[PDB]
Amino acid sequence: GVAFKKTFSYAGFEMQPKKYHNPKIALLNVELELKAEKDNAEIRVHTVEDYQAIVDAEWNILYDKLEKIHHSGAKVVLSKLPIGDVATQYFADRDMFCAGRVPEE
Amino acid sequence: PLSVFGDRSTGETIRSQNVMAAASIANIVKSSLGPVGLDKMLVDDIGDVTITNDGATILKLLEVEHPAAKVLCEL
Amino acid sequence: RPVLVLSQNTKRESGRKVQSGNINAAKTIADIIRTCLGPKSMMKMLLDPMGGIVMTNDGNAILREIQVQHPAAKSMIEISRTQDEEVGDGTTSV
Amino acid sequence: ASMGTLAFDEYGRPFLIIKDQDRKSRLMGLEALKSHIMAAKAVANTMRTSLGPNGLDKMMVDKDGDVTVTNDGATILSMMDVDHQIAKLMVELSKSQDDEIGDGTTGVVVLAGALLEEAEQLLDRGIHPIRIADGYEQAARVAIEHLDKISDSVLVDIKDTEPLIQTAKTTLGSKVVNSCHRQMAEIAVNAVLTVADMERRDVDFELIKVEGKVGGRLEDTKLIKGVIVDKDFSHPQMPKKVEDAKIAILTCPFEPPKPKTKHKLDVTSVEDYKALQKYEKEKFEEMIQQIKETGANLAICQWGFDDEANHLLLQNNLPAVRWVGGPEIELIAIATGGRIVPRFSELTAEKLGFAGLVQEISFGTTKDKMLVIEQCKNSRAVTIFIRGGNKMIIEEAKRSLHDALCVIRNLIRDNRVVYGGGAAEISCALAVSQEADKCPTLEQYAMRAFADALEVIPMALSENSGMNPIQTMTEVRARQVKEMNPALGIDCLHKGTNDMKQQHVIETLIGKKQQISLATQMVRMILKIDDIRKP
Amino acid sequence: DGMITETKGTVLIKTAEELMNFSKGEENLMDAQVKAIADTGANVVVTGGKVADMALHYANKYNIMLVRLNSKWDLRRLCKTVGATALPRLTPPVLEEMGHCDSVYLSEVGDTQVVVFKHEKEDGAISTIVLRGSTDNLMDDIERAVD
Amino acid sequence: CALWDVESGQLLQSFNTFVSAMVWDMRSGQCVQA
Amino acid sequence: LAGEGISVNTGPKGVINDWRRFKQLETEQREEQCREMERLIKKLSMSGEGFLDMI
Amino acid sequence: TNDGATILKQMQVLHPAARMLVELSKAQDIEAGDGTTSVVIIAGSLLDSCTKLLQKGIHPTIISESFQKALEKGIEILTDMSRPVELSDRETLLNSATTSLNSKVVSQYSSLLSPMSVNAVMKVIDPATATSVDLRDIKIVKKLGGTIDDCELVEGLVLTQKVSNSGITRVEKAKIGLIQFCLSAPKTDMDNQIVVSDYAQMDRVLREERAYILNLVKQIKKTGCNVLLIQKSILRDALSDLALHFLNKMKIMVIKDIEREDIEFICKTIGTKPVAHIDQFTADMLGSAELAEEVNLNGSGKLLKITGCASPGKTVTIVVRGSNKLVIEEAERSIHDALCVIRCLVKKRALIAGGGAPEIELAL
Amino acid sequence: ASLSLAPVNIFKAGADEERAETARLTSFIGAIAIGDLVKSTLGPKGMDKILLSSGRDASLMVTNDGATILKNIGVDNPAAKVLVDMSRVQDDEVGDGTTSVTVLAAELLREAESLIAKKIHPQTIIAGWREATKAAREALLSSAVDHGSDEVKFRQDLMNIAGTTLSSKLLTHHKDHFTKLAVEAVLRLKGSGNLEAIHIIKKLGGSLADSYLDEGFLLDKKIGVNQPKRIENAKILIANTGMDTDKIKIFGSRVRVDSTAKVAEIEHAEKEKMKEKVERILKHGINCFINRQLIYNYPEQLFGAAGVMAIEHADFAGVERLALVTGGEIASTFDHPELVKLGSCKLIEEVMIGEDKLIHFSGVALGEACTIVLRGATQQILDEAERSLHDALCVLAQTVKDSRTVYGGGCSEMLMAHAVTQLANRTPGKEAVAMESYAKALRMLPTIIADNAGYDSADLVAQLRAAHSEGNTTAGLDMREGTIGDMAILGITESFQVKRQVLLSAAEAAEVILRVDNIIKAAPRK
Ligand SMILES: Nc1ncnc2c1ncn2[C@@H]1O[C@H](COP(=O)(O)OP(=O)(O)O)[C@@H](O)[C@H]1O
Ligand SMILES: Nc1ncnc2c1ncn2[C@@H]1O[C@H](COP(=O)(O)OP(=O)(O)O)[C@@H](O)[C@H]1O
Ligand SMILES: Nc1ncnc2c1ncn2[C@@H]1O[C@H](COP(=O)(O)OP(=O)(O)O)[C@@H](O)[C@H]1O
Ligand SMILES: [Mg+2]
Ligand SMILES: [Mg+2]
Ligand SMILES: [Mg+2]
């Protein structure tokens, strides 16, 4: 099969189970963490309601990606790009294993 | 471990060095053998010029450092 | 601490280069006094290292005052001296 | 015997082959073997004095002047500033033994040194080093099989921990904590057993936190069935002691939300400014109300918070701590049985951890505080809190406890043990000698040299205890041959008996097998090398 | 990759819906472009610039072989050999600009991984001589002889 | 290191977050994360 | 700061190679220094190895 | 300098005993202000005697205990010799000031500096109640030029800042007011920008800025104020050119760049309550004064003097003048010594004779 | 063959190592040098030291504290580093005993050197020392006397402990006054161990006897401009709010308008927000207001117009001390005035100390926070007085925490050594010799005590040993006249915790150092 070293787990990783008996593996190239939508993106609002809507929209984007991964049926998640602590805790809540920054090979 | 104030060569290294020195001494004078041989010019550090074909004279005039080369010159 | 067969200040060269160099040295020595032959020869001024001046067109006199490093030129100088001593004439010609 | 080879051709022309060949060195064959064997012998002889209960410590000083007193062979060799390549190989061997096992990092070095010392006298008699390596490998296989044969199994049940305590005591006997020996062994055994996957699976050392604080005494070292954190309550006026605390672990700073994307908010009129101020105040009140509505008693954050949140937390009878580290947050979540929540809106009652007692600990006249969480329901994470009269013994106790935890972990992985004190290696030497008498004569010398090298550790133990090495080792070997008992070793502590089974000197079989294997492989490599090309 | 403005690109977001839908719309546009390219039958794509992650993913989804040629001279020579035209944008190619090669594959020669655009007919604008050997200097000498 | 108020010109405090690594926090004066 | 009686003991005999090499180099400089000092100060007030071994 | 504390501090002594003696002199200056030279000599003589005492074979602890006993007896003797003094007696205060000034360079000027120092101390304290004197309430201004005979005691406030107005240098019946905000274009603490999208918006911005400045100046003027002191400001222009022109048009003297640490002194001197927002700027905040003029020191500089106040509350200013820097510095030090002597007399109402009499009597 | 004494070289350039005899010699020399340096500053007749810094600052420090002396020295010997760290840890744990523990460790290592010279394996010495430490600890615990139940007896014990702690320091000149000062300061803590609540203010000038403990609290901050300088029956509100261009926490917010009139309106809105915050603060009904952070000119003017004192930039320690002394709550929000407790005091006024003005809080409500004014003749005197008071306060706080006390003046050392000798007299082998050396070092401690005073240490120690062997368990050195006497009658007592910590730390450090037989040094950075 394949074996590789553990790659800088974030907080809440030790709360994930470390053994599965028939897992489905989600091989991804995705950065699963809160971040700017784009490097050149700029948000212009003039209302506190829009401010709250924007922060909730960022959280909803992250949670929608995680929810899609969860209902994909996979139990093990691997990604080239970093997997943030929020995603790590989300996967721990659902009893899944996650590992970010996995080497390409 | 030996603690001898000097350099030491043992085995193939020293044998190869001796053979190389002897071969160099040979190649020095190999060009002055037989009627088709040609003479050589020896120039001192003060400008004195010596032209000769005799091997013994050539080996006497040269400065020789390796002991095997000294052996060949004295031979 | 280098190991050597000959001395570290001994230089050797051989082959076509040696013959070409010797012949070129002889040619240049001849060229030095080439124009000093015949009834229409010209004088040459030689500055002696001891401060003297030698003004002549004799081949041996001109060649004797020249200091050369290439041994072939030394051989040519000795040839001129031998010709001068044996008969006293024909140094430039020889 | 140096400066490579210098020829400068037989025609007088320059002869340059390797760049900077005049500034490089080279050793060929037997001289290189002798130099390597001498270097390994020097390293092993330096290490062998620190072997056994009577072994003495080494005082290591780094390049910055920091000084460390230790008995661990891997720790000594790691800090040693060597330049010989074989010394670096020996250091790497000790580090490998530490990584794989955690104990016996000094035995491997001594065994390898003895093996190479015997290989030197074999080489002097005209034996190819490859033959020596092959004989050593054969003898190592024989010794490993004998160790498996004479091994004994112990119970690794939680209900009865006496064999585990005995093994941890045997590991800790050589260390400075032998004053609190039994308490330290009990602490290590309980720490390993509390956090361990029961189905013979791995033991995660990351769930064992080993933190030491100066002051107190060595006997004050205790095992906390929870998490101890060097932080303290944010507001100085909140209570220092919370009982039946409902922990609320959060990773959101108690500040108004901030989009990650580059954003600008535009204030275009006075009413906009009033709306912004009201929004900020209501956000603070709302986060505090959301925290309070879950019924939590203590709230733990990771990224800190500002003055308004602090005063609202104090005003609502909600003790809180800020700037708790990520690993500490994870440990608290694991121990208290509560989940990690990323924002207030997702905080519910079912995600709250439980702690029997959360207390703030003072440390005398030092102004430094430290928070402790314990009395959890089924805490799966434990922490060891070490006290001492100076930081140096604190570090030594840290590494000694690490050795004990590693030994108990090895017992978890495999329950077979052998009796130490040199008894196991004496029996292995006897088995190797018996096997050599049957093999052809040519490998007999290598196998007997292997047996002699195996017999050095009992000799080192006897010498460190002051007894005569050769006489004691010969008597013990004769007793082992006469009465069939591979448990007879070297009475280092002068207890009056040579039977290690009664003395309860117990070693893991995995440790001895790894020692022998690693020493054999490193000796094989060192024997195989016959050329050095240092610059 | 999706082309961008040459002046300056700044994504302006004023509502939550735009922030929610921007990445989805960009990914859908990339998928549509890649599928439109594939629908013409182009099963091999050669590009002179970098390859985006989403573009590569959608190319892999539609079974499209990707080769990247940094040198512009190599791109021109490949266009001459196959018979295609280097499109300036990412629009799907019309039948005249669609090059054809009888076999394109990834192969390893010696200890080197190479991509081969092999014709079967004894024709083509460009022919390549592959040189083997044991020394770089000897192979350079053979190249000089071939020149 | 010390923090100075530009306007008033008075020494605020000597050591919302700054890092020298070693990060601090002037909202509490603690050394926070190492 | 004690132990003024160092008694280096085995040291000088164990590192005698470098000590003797430095001694030889210093003595080699010493003949040159002695040769050159015969001119300076002594009369001024009122390759080098080639010169040395020619004298 | 003749000051012992200054002499010890200036030269960088290296021996630890010398450093301790320097600290001793500094402590004596702090507690008393005079005798900084005598105390060091006393300590040196004590240790010189301790040399002979130690040479005889006496443990240092016994020496220290005996010295403590001698110190207690000496305090008793010194208290016995001294006589009570009353702060209402001007002659004793003048004599103390003259004695303090006898050893300094300003000894021929004692007839001028002794009454000046006595008046300066007595004007900043309540004689019937005060048990100590805060010397920070006596400001000393050092201006070059002239001679030490030109030292003058200002009952009001002296400012080294120059008037920004041109042509307005003397105001009578002044109404002084401190300003702690900026008279410039509006600028919020938040990040603020003005966005222009139409051509008319530019002239609208100019007109509205002018209107805002004019309204600020009109609000300032409507209170009857005619002399304005503006606190020093950074990160915002304290005094705009338009604001200065508007203030000049209304005949108002303007002084800017007032130091932050001098606000309390000015408020105590001229009775002006500082104002930080124009909303609260009213007439009651102003401090009335008889005259506020800028004087010229015969080409050696300009000083703004505000003499005569309706509420002259316990504050005086002293202007020290002289030929060169060294003499004015030493005059300042000597005047400070005289003020410290009067402060000591205020703290402890006891007077003792001088000229070595206490030392001789104590020795006997 | 040795690692360094081999034909092959195994080290980098500059790396060194010392084998058994050399390592033991170096460690013993370093330990003995440290012990001899720290000693002679021990006991009531100990002398002080001068520490000159070699740096550019060239700070001068005169001290008697052993930990202070050992901290500010550049020690190269690693054993010296071990002793220095042991003394520092002892100082951290308890305020006293640094010199005692260092000297005990040095004497133990000297005895270990003698035993090694007598051809005794160091493991035997270590085992004997462990047995001796166990016996001495048991005897010292058995001799402890507790007076926590009684009140006047506990007060007398506190007096005696403070006097004994201050006896060695420079404060012994006014020992009685300073002991009363320290015990009052500690008793004002109401049993809290927070020594940060006791503030020491060093003011130059005046006599050392002029030092005093303020009946209230003293603050070294300044009041506003227009605010009153004296308030009676003050109602205190302690806060940790902005009061200085307080900006909304939304850092992405900005002002973007199309005219300057809107900018002026936003300026007025900001000023109105600050005014509303000040009004909310004033709604608590307060006379004084202490804020941890700065207070700019607008809130200061508002407070002055309201007739309310506004003390600004009172740091975390300052606000904590004010809360402890007045009972107020450090509030950062003012939307619930009824849920915030207000401090109280009879009077607030400015005081004139030396040439500096301070704010005086008189008639405080709680008073669980002390300020101590130190007047001295030199900066070194002030620093030494501060350190001595710190030692006394630390020991008094430890005694309050644990009321068990033991007799000083060498009595505890004599009793522990007598127990060790009794144990050694019944033990066969060289462990008896090791335990006898342990007892010899314990005897050497009060021997150094007597030597520092110039008395005949040998005769006094012999008399003490005879008295302790006879059964006089309270016999001790009497430094008043140079004889021996009853420590219970003379009132020379010490904290049991301090003595136990000294014994255990010294034994532990000696055991750690004795186990070393090889010192390997890496190549330094320089
Ligand atoms: N009580 C004892 N009696 C006899 N031998 C012991 C005893 N305890 C430990 N030993 C021996 O001392 C040797 C050294 O152990 P230790 O120093 O703890 O680790 P390492 O093997 O890394 O040196 C072990 O091989 C063990 O057999
Ligand atoms: N006119 C005077 N006649 C006699 N003695 C004087 C006279 N003026 C001052 N002294 C004495 O000179 C001593 C030194 O005073 P001074 O130099 O002014 O300050 P300090 O005491 O700091 O040296 C004083 O003790 C004083 O008694
Ligand atoms: N008045 C006293 N009489 C006799 N011995 C004293 C007296 N005061 C202190 N000592 C002794 O001096 C020793 C050292 O105390 P000290 O020097 O004050 O602090 P440290 O313990 O840090 O050295 C104590 O062990 C104590 O027994
Ligand atoms: Mg002629
Ligand atoms: Mg071990
Ligand atoms: Mg005077």
Ligand SMILES: [Mg+2]
């Ligand atoms: Mg003390």
